Design a protein around this ligand. Sequence first.
Ligand SMILES: [NH3+]C1CCCCC1
Ligand SMILES: [NH3+]C1CCCCC1
Ligand SMILES: [NH3+]C1CCCCC1
Ligand SMILES: [NH3+]C1CCCCC1
Lengths: 419, 419, 419, 419
Amino acid sequence: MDKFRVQGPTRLQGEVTISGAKNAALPILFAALLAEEPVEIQNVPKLKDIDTTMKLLTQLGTKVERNGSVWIDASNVNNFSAPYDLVKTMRASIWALGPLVARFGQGQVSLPGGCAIGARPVDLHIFGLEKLGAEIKLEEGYVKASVNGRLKGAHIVMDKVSVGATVTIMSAATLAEGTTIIENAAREPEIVDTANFLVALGAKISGQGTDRITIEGVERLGGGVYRVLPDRIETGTFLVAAAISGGKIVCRNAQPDTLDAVLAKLREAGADIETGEDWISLDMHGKRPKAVTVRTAPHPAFPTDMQAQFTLLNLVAEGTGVITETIFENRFMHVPELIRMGAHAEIESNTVICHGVEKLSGAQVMATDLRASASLVLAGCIAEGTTVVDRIYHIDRGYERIEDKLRALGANIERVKGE
Amino acid sequence: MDKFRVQGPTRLQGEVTISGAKNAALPILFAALLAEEPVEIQNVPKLKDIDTTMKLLTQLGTKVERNGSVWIDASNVNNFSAPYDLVKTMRASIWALGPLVARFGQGQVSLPGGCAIGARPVDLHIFGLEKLGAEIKLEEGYVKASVNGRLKGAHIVMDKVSVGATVTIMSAATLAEGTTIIENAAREPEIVDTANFLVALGAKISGQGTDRITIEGVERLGGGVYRVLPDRIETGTFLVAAAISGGKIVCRNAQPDTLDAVLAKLREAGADIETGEDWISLDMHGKRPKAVTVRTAPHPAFPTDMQAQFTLLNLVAEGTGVITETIFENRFMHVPELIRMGAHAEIESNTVICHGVEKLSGAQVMATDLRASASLVLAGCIAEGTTVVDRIYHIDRGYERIEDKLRALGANIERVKGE
Amino acid sequence: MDKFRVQGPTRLQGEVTISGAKNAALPILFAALLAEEPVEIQNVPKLKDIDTTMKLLTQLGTKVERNGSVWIDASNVNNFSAPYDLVKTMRASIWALGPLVARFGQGQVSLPGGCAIGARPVDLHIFGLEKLGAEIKLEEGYVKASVNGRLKGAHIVMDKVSVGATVTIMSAATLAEGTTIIENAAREPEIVDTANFLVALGAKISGQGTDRITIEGVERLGGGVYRVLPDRIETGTFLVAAAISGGKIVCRNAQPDTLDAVLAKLREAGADIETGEDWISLDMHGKRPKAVTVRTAPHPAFPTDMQAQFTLLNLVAEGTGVITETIFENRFMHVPELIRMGAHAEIESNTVICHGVEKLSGAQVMATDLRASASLVLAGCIAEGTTVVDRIYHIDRGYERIEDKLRALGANIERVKGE
Amino acid sequence: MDKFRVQGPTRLQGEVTISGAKNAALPILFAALLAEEPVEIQNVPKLKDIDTTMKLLTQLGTKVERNGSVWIDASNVNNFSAPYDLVKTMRASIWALGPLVARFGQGQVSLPGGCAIGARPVDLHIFGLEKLGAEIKLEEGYVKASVNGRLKGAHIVMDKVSVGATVTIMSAATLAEGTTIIENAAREPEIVDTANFLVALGAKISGQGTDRITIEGVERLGGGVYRVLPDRIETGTFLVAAAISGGKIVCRNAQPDTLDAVLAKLREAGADIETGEDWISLDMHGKRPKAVTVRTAPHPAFPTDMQAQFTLLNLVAEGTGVITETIFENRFMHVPELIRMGAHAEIESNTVICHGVEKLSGAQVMATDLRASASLVLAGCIAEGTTVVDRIYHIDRGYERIEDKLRALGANIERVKGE
Ligand SMILES: [NH3+]C1CCCCC1
Ligand SMILES: [NH3+]C1CCCCC1
Ligand SMILES: [NH3+]C1CCCCC1
Ligand SMILES: [NH3+]C1CCCCC1
């Protein structure tokens, strides 16, 4: 069990290059199953689900090779069943279902099991595919879908906003007969990217980024070159590291319009921010952040994946700040860990009242959420002494080697394998 | 009791000139109590609360005269108590409190009474003034505020978004000593207008229209000329009248950027919309609206004051539409009335599942909410036969003589006084 | 000399606010000399002649101030001579003669000399005043009209239709004792607007717009507020600019009924025109106009002042169309310039035979007529490359900053101060 | 002849992407003739000489394709003559000589005649190849170099510092047997980049950038991917454009270390400069530069190619500053042009004494030098009015569409195709 030994305090300053978003890379890699011609998917992070995804794709008959880009040849896909040993590892594997049924008329995906029933993560994908004309077959542990001929464009009203389901329905709708209209569609930048990649291949999609997506089915999708958008959450993470350490950074390969709410909150914290078409710089000019009031909300509001990071900022800011979590219940496990690092906070329900302290003290901390865990590495950077963040695999799975990026901003961090 | 006798169906087409918003006019008229020099407030609707407001202002020693504009001379305000006989009529009279205390150090407003306690409408104004340094005195029926010297700029965190309170705090903060920062500020266009009017007089305010307003207190406010923004809800109302009748209209003196969500919903309904800097045209080209899915949300999302009007549109649209009300519980009283006019709908909780019918049938209908009541006049315009909308005073109080505007679009409507 | 440097091709689209007609504004300003009470002349363009007229009016003892309106107080006129220095710049200064004699019993206007004698410009004005009872005194350099008492109504048959003489006679007649009949009165919209202003101050005038104007003299004229009608020729110019560049335009503050013939011709050219009471929209829908046949004749037929502009529309349209000047000679001097931009046309007698070309090429062009000079700017905007229109001062004096209005529609234009 | 018509004043601000240095790209393209395997030359500007060189290379049997990179396959060179038709257009074609003889044993370059004899351009190249063992054959119209076997390393003392001869000698030496020493080698960044490309294909070169380059001949050179360094002079030009217009700019794809002297001078002028590894930001903060003293000298001192630009910065700066050319004569021919734009300067010997003026006035100007001609465009942008820079073809050949880059920074500029 790799852990991170962080020694502070260190001011974080320098340049960081942002990785492509895994949450844009994944749905686009699955959507590539619709492409008859070879595809080059650029700016793909090297992360565990990317590797599980290429292995899965390979199991279906896809020719996949990698390195900066992921090159895909899906012209000869011929195994329409995503097996449990390749899918047990990753929930995103549900995204192979839509493309297989839309293009080949059949698909099946093994499912991870449970005692809890009702509004399980895959349920909206099943019903979105069913809405589009697919015949669904379920038995515990798998979902099988098939369609007689082509899927048929449908007017789908999502009762709940789902990124997962929005991608499944949108992507399957590109080869459906006619027009599909998705109401109450997820607006996440990863949704827009997946829609643009699909358009790049020949799909007819509009409203991506808005609450209503319109898809005009076409006969087949071609191939092409497509660059995955920058990871907006990793960008925010780095921007908070320089903001909580009196730092100055430049985030390269960034996409500023995916972070309006985050940047606005940083500017309220006292940050001096400038942005380019592909970059964001932040300078605290050596000042302590000023506390902020944050309310997480669906994109494009302040993102819940930036909440633990902003908790940490209030916790070392000047003043009293409140973080209100409206998306997720229970996403405050970083709090007790930070209280152990010397923070002053009160959790009242789905909020934390933060009372900024000048300095934190190093500790043996652990969080299972990757944003909370990464916030712990960050506090460790500015805390006095040594901080040991355990169960670092949660960060490694969503951040392309954060210690190398952090070490490059002046952090004293080291990976400690075993013990 | 004036009622409206409406005979249809009539296609609604032509031009309508939008009135200034009463909800922008009211807070600006109260904010004019801060102006040492004469002020010309243009584009003020001629409505009951405008008349109660001028009478109140006059009682405080304000010189007020009217006609298109409302000219105010508040240099000699010298009676700082808003009496019950002038305020019992209007809740907005709470807005005299902030300006009187900020400018004169004392103010008192009579209050309408009740058995229900906790989060009463005036409570956030009292605590916002208290936050700014005012000493509050309460006894059932009145609120008295005074301050020793000047109010003092404060960092206020609103736990609930309040247009009312945002205006009170913002307006009082213009003469406070220092900077006031309002977190979770209401963003309504009426908030931006009131902020711009204040700026017009010499105030230092920024972030109006955003969730964080910053006010840098100044010593005194001057005078000037200011035009109240168009009424965005009356504009929406007219746009729905042409959209539900196969109509074509041009809304003059409009402000298109205050209605992005409304226009987007109309375009989803099949409307052909073009807008100018001050105008909006809509053409259904004789087609029936297509049903839409609507979710009311805080500005700038779809407004709850447009919900009854869009209920009516789904109810005569082609297809099944759902209206979800998230702002107000219980704002579906127009539904049973429309069901009586031949509509097909199901209310499930805070939603209505609408099944569009080609034509409605005239009826004796009544609604107490002015948007619901106005929606009833509109259905009456397109319904078969005669519709009698009773208790029309609810419309008259918020719409400058809608029958004249409607009659001008081809409606067969008549005011019937008594019986 | 100032020149306009234009870069095309550009599609002209957007909104344009039509300015008040200068030829309605000049006769109305001079007529204000009759007003005993202050008058506000709204919608007056800012053009050289307006400036000369305010200057001329001030010299008579009139108090005048400007900006969107021109405010006049002619209550203290004490000087009754319009001197050579002010009048040598403007032919319209003759218009001071009738109101001075009618109201004050005497007027004197300096005239520029010439060796030509015989049906000279002003002889209808001189003789029309003389038929109204004025005594006329002439010396080569000027004309003086005077009367003891009041002028007296007369039945006047004009041998030539003259807008200038119609205005002088009609304005003077408003204060004459009795009834004046003007047979063969000018029927132009600017005549009608002058009569309407006069009637607004209390005159009794009927038949304006007809071949016979009947005036019932009143003892005095008041004051008030009067808005100058929209410039119909500027309106057609902008409508032609959209029509020839595949554009879409909304002409605001327009008066559709003073342009019926132009609008009908534009619809014949393929234009999708919509009109309101104070606006006109034209949409080409990205298409090229279709050649049209035009015969210019006296108002309300197709106006000769729109001929240059429609000659340019036919030269870039689809097809062959001929333009005939039914009254005026030597009006196609801009056609050789346009042929130098790649146009195809034969000029035969009073007609220009046009053979539309798809695209023009920039050239160095010059027209001495205001309208033909404005047509050459319009041509620069659609031509390939750069057009340099020389001697632009005619356009500056007849169009209120046409470069700013064109620019707002998409034109790339520059004023070149050197030659 | 093409001219640039510029309209000022304009503040130049924004981002600009620096193009690859043409003078690094030319010597690298010719050096690719030595590569046995295909090579991708990235970051090559699209300029005339690049086009001439690809054309010249194709004639030798090289397979070349372009766009952001230049792809070369010199595996089949079968023709070893660079003919008059291709070379008469470009002096840099001499660079084909060394690689042809080194790799293929023979090369021939046509030379344009001249009646002047004696330390002619190419005599260092001819004699440098001859010291490497080549046999040189000369006839007035051309030079042919050939060798039986391999060239052989030699200790070469250059009597004159020459970038051209340094490139020919160093490139040829990479395939020679043994060690070549070049004493008094050119030290420019473009020399260093050429040596670095050579080393990238497998050469053994050290001391590039120093007064002595040591080469260890290898038997063959491979292939690969090599990116041309950023144009340092274009970088300084854009940095000067921000600095003289109160601007703010980010130079992207820059290499700060090839401009130390220019950056230090800019900081002396009042500029707020920040640098990264591939970017440079400069902010004037809306202020006017302060006059600076400049002495141009050999790299890495202040570059003579930045003199014209800094002469314009001093002429619009606050104060007096003198610019001295320490090596080159007759380099201030653009100063009379700038004095014609209202500048104050005395040209005394090899120095220009500058007295800053607050604003320039447009004029019709022309400079024959590329850099002085680019300085005159920059001057047009800040001057009042219109500047017409004639004979712009020098700038087109040395700067990759400077008008598009200027325009993106705010410049109003036009190419005028006629004279
Ligand atoms: N100002 C006028 C806009 C064109 C439509 C009607 C209003
Ligand atoms: N196309 C239109 C623009 C002007 C208002 C009415 C319709
Ligand atoms: N492209 C470069 C932007 C200036 C800052 C660092 C990235
Ligand atoms: N002023 C800045 C722009 C370039 C990136 C870093 C700071």
